[PDB]
Paper text:
Gene transfer agents (GTAs) are DNA-containing phage-like particles produced by some species of bacteria and archaea. The genes encoding proteins that form Rhodobacter capsulatus GTA particles (RcGTA) are derived from phage DNA, which has been integrated into the bacterial genome. Here, we use cryo-electron microscopy (cryo-EM) to determine the structures of RcGTA before and after DNA ejection, and to visualize the interactions of RcGTA with R. capsulatus cells. Particles of RcGTA have heads with a diameter of 38-nm and 49-nm long tails.
The RcGTA tail contains five discs of tail tube proteins (major tail proteins) (Rcc01691, g9), which are organized as a six-entry helix with a twist of 24.4° and pitch of 38.3 Å. The structures of the stopper, tail terminator and tail tube proteins have been determined to a resolution of 3.6 Å, and that of the distal tail protein to 4.0 Å. The N-terminus, short loop, and loop β2-β3 of the tail tube protein enable its binding to tail terminator proteins. The long loop of the tail tube protein mediates interactions between the tail tube proteins from successive discs and between the tail tube protein and distal tail protein. The part of the tail channel of RcGTA formed by the tail tube and distal tail proteins is filled by a trimer of tape measure proteins (Rcc01694, g11).
Residue numbers in the entry:
A (entry chain D), B (entry chain D), C (entry chain D), D (entry chain D), E (entry chain D), F (entry chain D), ...: 3 to 15, 20 to 136
The structure:
Amino acid sequence: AQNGKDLLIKLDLQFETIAGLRATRISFNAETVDVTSLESQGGWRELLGGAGVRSASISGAGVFKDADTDERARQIFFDGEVPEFQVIIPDFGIVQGPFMITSIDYAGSHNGEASYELAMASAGALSFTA
Amino acid sequence: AQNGKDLLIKLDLQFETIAGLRATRISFNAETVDVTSLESQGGWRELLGGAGVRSASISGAGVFKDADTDERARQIFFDGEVPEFQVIIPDFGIVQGPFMITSIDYAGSHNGEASYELAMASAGALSFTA
Amino acid sequence: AQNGKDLLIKLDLQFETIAGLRATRISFNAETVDVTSLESQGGWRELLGGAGVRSASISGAGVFKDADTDERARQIFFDGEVPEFQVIIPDFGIVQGPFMITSIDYAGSHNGEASYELAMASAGALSFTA
Amino acid sequence: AQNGKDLLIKLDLQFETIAGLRATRISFNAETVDVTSLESQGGWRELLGGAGVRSASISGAGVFKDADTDERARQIFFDGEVPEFQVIIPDFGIVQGPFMITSIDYAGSHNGEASYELAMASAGALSFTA
Amino acid sequence: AQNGKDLLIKLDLQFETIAGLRATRISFNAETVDVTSLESQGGWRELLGGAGVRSASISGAGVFKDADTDERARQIFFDGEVPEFQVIIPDFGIVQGPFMITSIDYAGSHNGEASYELAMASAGALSFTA
Amino acid sequence: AQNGKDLLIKLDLQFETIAGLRATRISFNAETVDVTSLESQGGWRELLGGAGVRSASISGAGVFKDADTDERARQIFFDGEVPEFQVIIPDFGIVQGPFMITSIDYAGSHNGEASYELAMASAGALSFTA
Amino acid sequence: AQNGKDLLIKLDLQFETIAGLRATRISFNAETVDVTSLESQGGWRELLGGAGVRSASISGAGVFKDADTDERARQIFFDGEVPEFQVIIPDFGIVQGPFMITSIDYAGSHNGEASYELAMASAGALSFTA
Amino acid sequence: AQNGKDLLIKLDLQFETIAGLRATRISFNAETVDVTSLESQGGWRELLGGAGVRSASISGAGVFKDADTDERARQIFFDGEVPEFQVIIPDFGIVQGPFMITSIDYAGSHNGEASYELAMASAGALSFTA
Amino acid sequence: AQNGKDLLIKLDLQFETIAGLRATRISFNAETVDVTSLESQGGWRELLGGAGVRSASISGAGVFKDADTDERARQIFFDGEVPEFQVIIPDFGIVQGPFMITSIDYAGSHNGEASYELAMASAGALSFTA
Amino acid sequence: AQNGKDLLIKLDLQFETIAGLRATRISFNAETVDVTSLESQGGWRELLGGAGVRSASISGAGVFKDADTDERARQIFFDGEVPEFQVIIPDFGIVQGPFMITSIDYAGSHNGEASYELAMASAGALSFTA
Amino acid sequence: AQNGKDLLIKLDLQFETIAGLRATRISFNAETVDVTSLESQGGWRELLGGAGVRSASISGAGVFKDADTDERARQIFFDGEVPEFQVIIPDFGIVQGPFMITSIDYAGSHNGEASYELAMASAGALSFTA
Amino acid sequence: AQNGKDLLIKLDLQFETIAGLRATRISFNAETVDVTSLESQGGWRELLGGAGVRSASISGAGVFKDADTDERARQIFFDGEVPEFQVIIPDFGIVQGPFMITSIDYAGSHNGEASYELAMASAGALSFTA
């Protein structure tokens, strides 16, 4: 078993995690390049595999606590960059990829928190430190 | 931690917040200009970053209490303008952007309130007072 | 605070509200005419404002109680007209717009009411009595 | 107030209601023929009204009890017809329209009923008996 | 009233029902061939009726209990056929139609069942035994 | 009855199941090649059957426990392959198909687990060991 | 001080109290329409007041003594009506409201009485004679 | 006053009461179909009345004495039926309704009786012999 | 020590306590806005504090003695208001808040009193006179 | 009359009762499949009867005396089985059903017994030996 | 053995216990983050442990004696804070945690005391002085 | 018969029982994975058995006497672990399972003891020494 407190996204400025990090989710994708020739041993769909583009997307939720890493993401959004982002998996290790800052949003209610979602997507080739 | 009572949207007439402000949510966006060349170190999707257009959208909910700032939004809608709007983040600061008044709606039930949603979207270059 | 019992939609025949008026909701819109030139001080989306068309839509729910104003809406639907409709906001005032009768529906169950939704949309220039 | 037990859909064979009639809902529509000229007193959307086509749709739910009127709907579906259907509104009166039998479905579970939905749509000019 | 235990889908091999048959639902359709001429006594939509194609779709849910009729459906899927399927309605009778085996799926959790959905659709002319 | 603990997806490296396997679901498909000629004994839709392509999709949920089979799926994703995957059905048997690793995602919260979904789709002709 | 023997519920047939009236309890309600705007002088919850629906419920206990007023309540239950009911408060006065007969129950033991509870709820606008 | 020994539930086989009948309680219900329109003379809740479904439930307690009427209830439970049940009210009269045998339970202790509860609920239209 | 006879709720008409005041209980609340970030020095739950809404509720029991202050509460209920209410704490002092009259109920038995409960809840910002 | 000492639950190993059997209670259930069509002679709820699933639950209390039948229940719980259980009714006879061992619990105090509850529920079709 | 007079809750102003402290109860919690993988040596539920959030709640009862520490809690409630609270365990030691003042209530009867409950909950990381 | 003084819960540090152990109760559970197919010989509910997850929960009450095993549980709670716990059944034997320390609470009154409840739940696979 691995603690959900262990997997951490973190910005550059040298890497530090953001403050409100209530729920985060790295999500990989591939578009499944269908190569269905007429011949196929039972009429099954055949796929190519390595031809497909592959992606990554980070969706971080949290409560707005002011930190320099939280101010950094605003500066990354206004001065639109694609810097290095890094996401630990507990016992796998970090990812250390270039991402962008696709859509952030700050929210607040009459009774609750200052909360924020932070949605990111892949911008380059990723890595894995094991 | 930051109080959700602190983040406030406010109209011009000089800036004052609207009356029913039950839930508000500034939401930024970027359309992620995909620049996927054939070469990429693992077949990863590459992104450009700063080429993407960037936006902002404000969705304010609340209960209809008559105020001059609430009458102002009706006047902003009928006389269709794009005036300056300003949204505080608690410990970041204000935004102070030109927005429009994209869609408002007043609602009432047989037993509940006169309530209203107020949806806005970005209309120009934004700012940040820190 | 304003009572939800106060905001009232009403038909012409001279104006009278309909019988079952369980939940009603005037909803305004504008389509946000995007004018995004290449220049923009941070790559922000610029909007025009007053060029956008603007609309209104009324969605009234209620229980079927037979009234002359309820029979009027059937006559407005079959003899398809766009007469004047009027919606009070409690402390703002009336709207007094020409609408049509876009979609109505009567519903009933084995145990419940004869209920109806009544969906309307803008058909002309609106007003505001303050 | 009007009882939901009063509003009844009924088939021809002379008119009789179907057996399982748990929830029924006549639903009218019009497609809102937008006539938005450049001139309009506040930039409001103008509509034409009577040019729009108008429709009706009946969605009847119920439990499968075998009746001749329930067998009739199967015969109306296989021998595809558009016969006269009639829906009472409690204190308005009947509708008496030609409809078709667009989609029916029979359902059953390991523990529950033999249930059925019966979806109809308008096929001609409707009426109103007052 | 009719028991939901009575309505049964069944495969050929001679007809036998499948093992896990938790919830099943035959669903008929017609696409409603709109014939809306300019003339129509109130501007009502006119429909043709018998010109529309008509269909049937069976969605059977259940828990995976191994039976020869359950193995048959796998053989019907891999060796893609359109054999005769038969669905009883309690007091109507059987349907006895040619269907295909459009999409099946087996599912299991860490604590629950081996469950399966079985989705079918019409493949020919249907029948009714009364 | 069959235990949901019995149906197991498993990777190659020789086959071993993955660690967190909270909910898994093989899902087959066929696109239903509609062959609707003008003649049909009641206007019923006719289908061809064996002409349709047929597919399979595996959606595995689970909690991130580090295993070599869990590291294998990351290596299958970055070095994009279409290796053999194998899914037991309790009393049917295995499937043993070539699949790809279409989209995986790792997720974690401030209080919960390191969890992951693992979505796969068919890449070749499948099998069945009975 | 006021005698509990004085407060009396009574049916119409002209008003007479029921026979076994061991314990009776009129109970009023309001659902407290919460209008909590973001501003509030100490973060206190603000309420609207008059927007809330208001109700009444009568729970009468007693021993089954046969009377015409006791037979009346059975006739009110089977022929489901909402007639006028009247409840005296000793020195306030009567209420004289339309109620329904929501749930009655007759009970008896091997040694005790024929007893009954009689639960009623508001059905219209109430009154007060002072 | 009426003796609690007089009110008797009784099964069919011709009607005979069950043996252990320590405490019995017929209980009627109606779900109170709320029809609360926006207009109401003091904001009072309005109710419809006759639209509500109405029910009956019998809860019989007693000590297990073997009788043919006690064996009958076991046969009614295993061979699940909805036969006629009849409950006398002392000076009102019988009820004579179709009920089912919803939940029975036999209980015994190391020192006490063989006791049983017998819970029934309405299954059809009831009656009243006066 | 402080006498329970000292703490007194009182209505406006100028403030006077109600007659039967057998047991009274002001009760304050806050909904505890949970702000649990992933970081926390032992995994402890962190809370925000001042963001939570805060309330007050008064539950007064007593015997119905007719007084003008007791008639006032009936008038406050029928003419639904939110007037000022005031509750002394013996050596703290008064509260002097706006409340509503949420649910009152009058009760009487065949042998006991005319008794009443009186339940109130906060409607505005409260105070404290020290 | 029947002795509570006579009704006995008993395990298989051939059937023997457990040691501490202070209070035991077989409890049957049915979920009452509501079939309420719009028509019903007085608006009464109609029920289907035999469509409902039916269950059984055994709750045995007792003091922990070590017996092989008491050790058997621990072995039935750890090696999770659904073996045959048998419950005598004094003059009815046995039940002889397959049950599971849903929840057991051992309890002891500083002064009292080693006591245990043993809760079981139905797992198959039951019987009755008369 | 340890005296219940020894365990004491105490406020800051430097720490002093409150006056009426009739019954007090610190209560800790953890939400038990269920990590139940499909594999488990007997089908047992597996738990993670340290991932769960952990809490504390203090419920203090007492009689209202006016003290500065009792006035402090009112000031902590109106000026909503989360100050340090401290609870001795007799021979363990203090806790010294930040709590809030979630719900207090003052109560009094016609014959008894001015009594109060004081309910608190954890607001931060706690401690232990041993 | 078995003494309640014999069944003992005990912590690790090697195993020792806690000091105040006034009432303790191991409680096992299984969630009863319902596998109710449409076929069942009398419409009885069928269950699977071994698919259900199985649990254990320990609720220990006692008076706070300071011991190293009592200090251990505080250390187990703050440093959140899931160590081995062991519960003797008198003549069965020990259990020896991994549990967590889900919720403890210390309580004291103005006249009584320092008392504590200690609630635990299963965290892994259990055992049985016979």
